[PDB]
Structure 1
Amino acid sequence: VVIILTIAGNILVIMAVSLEKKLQNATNYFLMSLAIADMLLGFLVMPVSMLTILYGYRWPLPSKLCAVWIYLDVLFSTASIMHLCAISLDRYVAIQNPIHHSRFNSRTKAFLKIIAVWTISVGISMPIPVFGLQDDSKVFKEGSCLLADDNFVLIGSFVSFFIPLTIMVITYFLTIKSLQKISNEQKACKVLGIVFFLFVVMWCPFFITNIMAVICKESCNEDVIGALLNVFVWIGYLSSAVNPLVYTLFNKTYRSAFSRY
């Protein structure tokens, strides 16, 4: 059911930009690209995880395909985090300095920000396909599909998520501070706050459990950590479905487009 919503919401978002040409602004191209990453993640990755859940957490799929699956789950997931990080940076720049942002608000730089995000997503996720496909034990370890290089993993989870997280946590808070510096401004503070709170609460638990697992493997119980990771990956996947409904709620035209289709 999470997979259905995750696919469907992004599918509606991507068409609504095309079917309704009013949302041809530069921002909604970023928003449709984030929807693309989320829908791709829902289509390619998540039913496989549901299948492993049914089959007992053993990888029925061909052996080397396990290597690319994890790679997809890094690239599509890292892209969404980088999309939201760039959204936070650009929206903070818009709030703090609205006039000067309009001078450089041309779409030509907006496309460079897209190429930057989708380039950094590949740059972060380079090792997993080539290394995992070469050595099964690196990414197929324990008989269940899992990425198992501690040295690479603990830094990779950090740069991919925490570095955007501090950029989000230092920009979002500052965006509220700019609004504070009446009713028009303060209404944005709460709506920004809920969006920040959900994605932090839904993304962060997986990563802290992963880093806690790698560091504390000597001093922790494996089974509880495994169950927690099994559920927290689902919650992180729900993070993908979350954003289209947020789009539906605050914007008039997306709501009309989804009501029609």
Structure 2
Amino acid sequence: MKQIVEEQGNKLHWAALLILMVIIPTIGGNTLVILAVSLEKKLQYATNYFLMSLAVADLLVGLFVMPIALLTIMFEAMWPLPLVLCPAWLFLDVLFSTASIWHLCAISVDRYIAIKKPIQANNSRATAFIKITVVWLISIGIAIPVPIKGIETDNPNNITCVLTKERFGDFMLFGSLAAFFTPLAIMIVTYFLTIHALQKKAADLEDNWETLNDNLKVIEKADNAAQVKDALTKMRAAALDAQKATPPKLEPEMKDFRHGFDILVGQIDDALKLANEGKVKEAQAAAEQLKTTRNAYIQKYLVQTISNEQRASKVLGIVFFLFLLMWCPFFITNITLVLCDSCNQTTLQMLLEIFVWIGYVSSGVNPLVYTLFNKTFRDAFGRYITCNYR
């Protein structure tokens, strides 16, 4: 058919679109995160070492994967680079993309552990390296079938760098399950686990609050010393119990309310030492002054603890939701490409060519968006874009 003219002429304007909107924001966005953790001494702790690893994983996407992904648009007919670069590029493409997804899955669980068990800390430098290594080891095992099986290449060196359904059909199915849907399910579970964790934490703080106040009236209306003795001990327990629901202020220039329990317990011990000697009327007067410590520190500590754990949980879910949501158009399409044979797989491959760039920008700017809710990071970025540093 001479009428049938598949020009397939030019797509340079789309490459300029992807550099300006996807590639540059990826490279620059992750360089700033790396710069911040590296040369800002106030940002160097166990969490940001894992976050910097994520920034490296996404910086390597826009530095190696995404630039060569444009040559598949300019020269969609045939692979221009040497043959050995085609399995290498596909390998790094699966490696780094999986490393970004599994990084957030670990961060999501780490944040949940920090809510259920705030005691463990200094979560040392080694615990970070263990988590870093495992994530990178998981991603290698998922990206390793690509170079092992290899391109489908006698040959005129005519190579199409693509994951065909005939050759990698079993990989595209189970490789999407392990790399995307498995950490997706984990983050759904840890989501509802966090809702239950923040509510159980608030209800316990509420009962510790009532325990203190109820025992105060027990002390005031007390007639016997033995009643005051087992009323301050129960207060001292509930005071330490509510204080253990928050990591020490050791681990911020403004007021620290968590110290009010150190003050509270110290007074309770003295007021109980008076109860041990027998000075009841003098001990009840000291328990009345426990309200001064309560009205100043304890009252605003309970709201500051619940509100901050609630706000940080909501913003962490949103940014981890949009990341997963923008990677959904690719993997859902990638699965049905194998599990649907009625579908036209020519246009179904065209959609994968588009949906990857939705996921690329989703991974590339993901560390930047996440760090733009930490003021120390933002103030560092504002000095870097003006080329200030120190």
Q: TM-score, normalised by structure 2?
A: 0.61
In the alignment, structure 1 residue 61 sits paired with structure 2 residue 81 = yes
User: Once the two structures are aligned, what percentage of the paired residues are identical?
Assistant: 65
Comparing 181-190 with 220-229, greater Cα deviation is found at 181-190
Aligned mates of 1:29, 1:256 — CA distance in 2: 19
User: 1:248, CA displacement in angstroms?
Assistant: 4.2
User: 1:7, CA displacement in angstroms?
Assistant: 0.8
In the alignment, structure 1 residue 122 sits paired with structure 2 residue 140 = yes
In the alignment, structure 1 residue 96 sits paired with structure 2 residue 112 = no
Comparing 54-63 with 81-90, greater Cα deviation is found at 54-63
Deviations 1:153-186 (Å, cap 9, x if unpaired)?
A: 2111111221111111111332233224443233
Q: TM-score, normalised by structure 1?
A: 0.89
Which residue of structure 2 lines up, in the alignment, with residue 52 of structure 1? 72
Aligned mates of 1:45, 1:189 — CA distance in 2: 32
Contact 2:51 2:367 in 1 (8 A): no
Contact 1:59 1:143 in 2 (8 A): yes
Comparing 124-133 with 194-203, greater Cα deviation is found at 124-133
| Paired residues for 1:100-115 under 5 Å | 101-102=120-121, 105-115=123-133
> Structure 2: which 5+ residue stretches go unaligned?
1-19, 201-305, 385-390
> Structure 1: which 5+ residue stretches go unaligned?
none
| Paired residues for 1:24-173 under 5 Å | 24-56=44-76, 58-99=78-119, 101-102=120-121, 105-132=123-150, 135-136=152-153, 144-148=160-164, 149-173=168-192
Q: Which has the larger share of helix?
A: 1
Aligned mates of 1:175, 1:57 — CA distance in 2: 49
Aligned mates of 1:150, 1:77 — CA distance in 2: 19
SS of the residue 2:60 aligns to: helix
Aligned mates of 1:6, 1:65 — CA distance in 2: 22
Deviations 1:103-149 (Å, cap 9, x if unpaired)?
A: x722222211111111122222222113215x43xxx9x95321231
Aligned mates of 1:63, 1:223 — CA distance in 2: 24
Aligned mates of 1:224, 1:177 — CA distance in 2: 44
Aligned mates of 1:57, 1:168 — CA distance in 2: 39
Q: What amino acid sits opposite 1:24 in the alignment?
A: Q
SS of the residue 1:145 aligns to: coil
SS of the residue 1:45 aligns to: helix
In the alignment, structure 1 residue 195 sits paired with structure 2 residue 316 = no
Aligned mates of 1:168, 1:123 — CA distance in 2: 21
Contact 2:104 2:320 in 1 (8 A): no
Q: What amino acid sits opposite 2:179 in the alignment?
A: S
Question: May I ask how many residue pairs the two structures share in their alignment?
Answer: 253
Cα gap change, 1:189/1:39 in structure 2, threshold over 3 Å: closer, same or farther?
A: same
In the alignment, structure 1 residue 184 sits paired with structure 2 residue 316 = no
Comparing 188-197 with 78-87, greater Cα deviation is found at 188-197
Which residue of structure 1 lines up, in the alignment, with residue 33 of structure 2? 13
RMSD of the alignment, in Å? 2.0
Comparing 89-98 with 118-127, greater Cα deviation is found at 118-127
SS of the residue 1:105 aligns to: coil
Aligned mates of 1:259, 1:194 — CA distance in 2: 24
Aligned mates of 1:143, 1:214 — CA distance in 2: 22
Contact 1:79 1:118 in 2 (8 A): yes
Aligned mates of 1:76, 1:241 — CA distance in 2: 11
Contact 1:179 1:189 in 2 (8 A): no
Contact 2:33 2:368 in 1 (8 A): no
Contact 2:30 2:368 in 1 (8 A): no
User: 1:231, CA displacement in angstroms?
Assistant: 1.4
